[PDB]
Design a protein around this ligand. Structure first.
Ligand SMILES: *C[C@@](*)(O)[C@H](CCCNC(N)=[NH2+])NC(=O)[C@@H]1CCCN1C(=O)[C@H](N)Cc1ccccc1
Ligand SMILES: *C[C@@](*)(O)[C@H](CCCNC(N)=[NH2+])NC(=O)[C@@H]1CCCN1C(=O)[C@H](N)Cc1ccccc1
Lengths: 17, 251, 27, 251, 27
């Protein structure tokens, strides 16, 4: 849940964009 | 949205998901009105009684979503606020009078089949679609049930009629003002619906039978409970505020 | 200024599942 | 990995990422050895000095990755620990002796062209291959520079020579054991490369010229700096900790 | 058992860009 990033939704992993 | 439908792809391009950065989670709706201005409900930003007060830096802007959860990668766009303006006579203290807020993006937006702006009304158009009887469309990803506290996985549409001034005022105990409007079926009109918690800012549009373009009439502002009988929800009156909007966007 | 006209609808010139409802409410 | 290259796709099937749920951040490496069993370095999960102690619940195992950050949605398989087993004579207090952990997943893993297990050595494969002078290959998404405390954008591979008992020992002040090994070039061989922080648990493998399969020989355990002139990296000695593995892996 | 036989390689019978530096290594 953090910088740059964005929470996706399958093992609510962060996707860093 | 309580008692809605599932939105259709590309069906509502001016919709914006206002994102709380931390914890990562949904705040409210918004509407793209141009390529760098977005319009939301003032109490999404500031609401002192609950100690809500965000900065152009607590929010992330998502344009072109459908799915609430999914980070739709080559569709969706994420932007960040350069400024944010709250209508100075926004009444957080009494009854949310003038729950209108404008947030200006740091950079413009790319309009895809999915990212596209909604028109603001004319004293002209404002005057003939805003009338008891006429249905407007409300949109969002907040609470489905008044009390489920749940959330839709995809955009929700719901088409409700515009109710009559008294009706509304007689409906609640709150101080209704000229900068509000209520929408919905009567306790006996055998249809339901309503916007709800998590749906503020989202557009309440109307499709012009003339020039045949989609317009914004209200901004989901407040209500009492959700899809409750003989009780309607309130929307900021955008055209009465059309000049403050005119005003900040210029200069 | 291109506003309120929907790429995938108002242009392709298709109607969405329930806008007929709306248009029918006026008048 | 310091002094590495970019991994080519599908180059390290057995490689596993071990991710902290919150703050969502990389923790270490792992190797997939079977479909629902995984092997990691023990201090990744427990290191009292530093206040480290995790569970079958603060970690996510991310299998079949390449991009360190990108949530590679159709290729990777996120999983969860059912149980974590740490070697009973794991030495935190003295020299990290027996840096070995085994975590077995709740459900088995789908083998992709990406998800494929690595083989453990035989008394003999382990025998003829574990010889000074021979190159092994290390991989990980940890720190790029001793001090960058940056991070690889994609997996990192790097090949290193296995050094000799002596050299290693004289190489440090720390106590060596029969259960460790050093790998890397002499400060005279004009080549470099090292494993580094955020690298533990990842596999140190060798490709067998007999059967031409890939074996796991070492585990990234410890070091002093990273890519330091004449200081080598220590890998846990898997062949030699292999009966415990074979053991936990019956029940 | 299927182990250590990389599918995009050993099976498609293709070599990675460096696995042969590794072999010249061994003996
Ligand atoms: C910000 C919005 O998401 C939301 C509106 C939900 C819409 N409800 C229905 N039925 N369409 N607003 C709020 O919660 C605001 C802010 C503070 C209180 N509030 C309410 O809507 C209260 N339920 C009522 C209210 C309180 C004070 C002043 C006006 C209304
Ligand atoms: C946990 C692994 O990420 C890491 C080793 C990284 C590879 N090292 C190099 N450069 N090839 N291990 C550790 O951090 C261990 C655990 C605690 C301290 N530690 C160290 O490597 C220290 N830098 C040195 C050391 C301290 C205590 C006992 C043994 C070694």
């Amino acid at each position: 849940e953090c910088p740059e990033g964005y929470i996706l939704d399958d093992g609510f992993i962060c996707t860093d964009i | 949205i309580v008692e809605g439908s599932d939105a259709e792809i590309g069906m509502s391009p001016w919709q914006v998901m206002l994102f709380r950065k931390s914890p990562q989670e949904l705040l409210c709706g918004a509407s793209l009105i141009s390529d760098r201005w977005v319009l939301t409900a003032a109490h999404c930003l500031l609401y002192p009684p609950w100690d809500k007060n965000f900065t152009e830096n607590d929010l992330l802007v998502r344009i072109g979503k459908h799915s609430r959860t999914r980070y739709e990668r080559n569709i969706e766009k994420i932007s960040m606020l350069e400024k944010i303006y709250i209508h100075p006579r926004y009444n957080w203290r009494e009854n949310l009078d003038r729950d209108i807020a404008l947030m200006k993006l740091k950079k413009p937006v790319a309009f895809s089949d999915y990212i596209h702006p909604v028109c603001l009304p004319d004293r002209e158009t404002a005057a003939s679609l805003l009338q008891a009887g006429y249905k407007g469309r409300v949109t969002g990803w907040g609470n489905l049930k008044e009390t489920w506290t749940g959330q839709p996985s995809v955009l929700q549409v719901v088409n409700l009629p515009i109710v009559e001034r008294p009706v509304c005022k007689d409906s609640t105990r709150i101080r209704i003002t000229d900068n509000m409007f209520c929408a919905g079926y009567k306790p006996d009109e055998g249809k339901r619906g309503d916007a709800c918690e998590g749906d503020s800012g989202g557009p309440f549009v109307m499709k012009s039978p003339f020039n045949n373009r989609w317009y914004q009439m209200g901004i989901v502002s407040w209500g009492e409970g959700c899809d409750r009988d003989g009780k309607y929800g309130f929307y900021t009156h955008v055209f009465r505020l059309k000049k403050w909007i005119q005003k900040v966007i210029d200069q | 200024a291109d506003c309120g006209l929907r790429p995938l609808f108002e242009k392709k010139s298709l109607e969405d599942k329930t806008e007929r409802e709306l248009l029918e409410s006026y008048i």
